[PDB]
């Protein structure tokens, strides 16, 4: 693949001194931007999310408005569940559902071997081949997918919650079917991980997006293992293979209360929600990892100025090292992209300016 | 095998009042699909068929597009020749052919034991489990065969033909060797049939796609003993194996003039080419039977308006009861699923209209 031009998110990720705050924003492509809605037009979701040449474009139109020092795949976190066998729909204005939930034991024998998931994905390596290539080394491209429990929650819920209450009621009255199925999840995502670095991605993000319906006990329990296994054997993997281990991120939104735990769960950056200070997410995670975030997503509903403004102060809070900018969460719809533009420049400027 | 979420198939098929008319396609899994035909490039045709995760996928993608009240497994009625030992390919661009047909009675030797075919068919049982397991409820899972003399056919002529000249010259040349062949088939027959029950299917249905080369004497004579054996002998096999019998479906095509010898051969429904005007064919099978069918294939070539209104004179002719909709034949492949859609909505918008 092309050289490697922008490094800058890479060595902020591995822990090194750079000359500027590196920014990326969860979900930069997305909604928000007409051009997106204009491609996505073209087809159903998750026929888009098989177009290598469509995920390939939708990834690059954020960078062409913004310079933003890293690249997200287009994707989603549910293809792990969809090729472990589960049906999926993407319900008008409605979002993401499994009309056929598990919901008992025995219904983890409609799943897939996890071993044959990663075949089942050859669609996402192709389109981070493709947008690696298309990408020309202009700044790192990173994969992701979402997190056993998370995986754990649509696959049971079949859908959003705002309880987990039937995830929950699984952890507590099914412990061991439980474990199967994050064991499941782990055993897949681990070689579909792999393969996105085979395939060309820089970094990944591994997404807890349902940390915080947890308390410390069960996460410990049924959360935290399974991150800890998917780091330790994609790096392993990796190294037999022949291939550089790419820097791996964490985020577990809600998840304040595992932030000492994640940051000696394997990864070199554990990225953060709106809702942790930064001086009080360094002071759990300590001096050795690397914090991403954490800019309230709706603090770009305020004016250019004011962004400007608030993004200074979280710059100073973290101080200018071990730390990659970005906001809390990923995007809303209803976004305006010149505001999305005045956080990436102001990261940029105020960081430098935080440096001499 | 997950509990069945949606029954109203069978149902109908055992003739209970439902609240709206389910509806399923012939060939619902077939080349008027772009992505059945991209799955099928893969592998030649009865590859596929050996392939439990190809036809199970086949299978599902009609339903990702309709909601059909029923899927049936992915398979041919040439499996059960073959599994007798005969040998099969598929023509490019032409169609099954058997290079070495029966020809004469001593062509018969060839063929294995009628009772070790069954073990021959074990991919088949395998597809129709993972499918039960993969559909988790959905929907029920037909499974199917060829009748006798619709077998009987291939095996002679060597593929299709428009009149079954050297198939008929055994019927009145060869007598006995046709009812020892008849016989064969049907031992066959019986077991395939209780095994994809053993496997899953939640009804069966028996295609006599050439019943209507016989006139009335030599279809009482040659077709109709062997399809009341099958469905006799099924029955009685479930039964004594500790299983639920499932509706049986008799589909002669072309055969107006066997309707009521068929309303009397032990299958809750009768399905129906687009020849027969649905009050006569009520007027020939009685008042238990279920009717299945019957739009013209070919309707599906008008505009979605027009289909709809067909679709409603169809129902207005059937009545609210004892009826499952479906095309008179399957779906031809440079037909658009747009139509196929517009069909499967109109049958359900009508039915409900028609009930109040």
Request: glycine share 8%.
């Amino acid at each position: 693949f092309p050289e490697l031009k922008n490094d800058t998110f890479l060595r902020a990720a591995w822990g090194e001194e750079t000359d500027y705050t590196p920014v990326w924003c969860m979900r930069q492509a997305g909604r928000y931007l007409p051009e997106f809605r204009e491609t996505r037009a073209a087809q159903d979701f998750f026929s888009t999310c098989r177009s290598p040449e469509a995920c390939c474009e939708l990834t690059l139109q954020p960078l062409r408005r913004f310079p933003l020092d890293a690249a997200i795949i287009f994707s989603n976190i549910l293809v792990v569940p969809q090729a472990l066998g589960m049906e999926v729909t993407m319900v008008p204005g409605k979002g993401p559902s499994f009309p056929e939930p598990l919901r008992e034991e025995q219904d983890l024998e409609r799943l897939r071997d996890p071993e044959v998931v990663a075949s089942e994905l050859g669609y996402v390596f192709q389109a981070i081949t493709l947008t690696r290539q298309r990408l020309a080394g202009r700044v790192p491209l990173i994969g992701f997918a979402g997190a056993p429990w998370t995986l754990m929650t649509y696959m049971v819920e079949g859908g959003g919650s705002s309880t987990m209450a039937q995830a929950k009621r699984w952890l507590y009255q099914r412990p061991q079917a439980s474990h199967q199925l994050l064991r499941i999840l782990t055993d897949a995502l681990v070689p579909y991980l792999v393969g996105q670095v085979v395939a060309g991605a820089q970094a990944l993000q591994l997404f807890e997006s349902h940390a915080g319906h947890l308390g410390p006990q069960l996460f410990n329990k049924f959360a935290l293992p399974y991150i800890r296994d998917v780091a330790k054997q994609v790096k392993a993997r990796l190294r037999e293979a022949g291939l550089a281990p790419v820097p791996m991120i964490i985020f577990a939104k809600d998840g304040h209360f595992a932030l000492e735990e994640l940051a000696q769960a394997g990864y070199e950056v554990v990225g953060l929600d709106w809702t942790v200070a930064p001086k009080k997410a360094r002071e759990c995670v300590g001096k050795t990892v690397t914090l991403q975030g954490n800019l309230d997503p709706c603090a770009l509903y305020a004016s250019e100025e004011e962004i400007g403004q608030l993004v200074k102060q979280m710059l100073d809070d973290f101080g200018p090292h071990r730390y990659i900018a970005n906001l809390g969460h990923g995007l809303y719809p209803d976004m305006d992209p010149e505001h999305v533009g005045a956080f990436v420049d102001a990261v940029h400027k105020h960081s430098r300016l935080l440096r001499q």
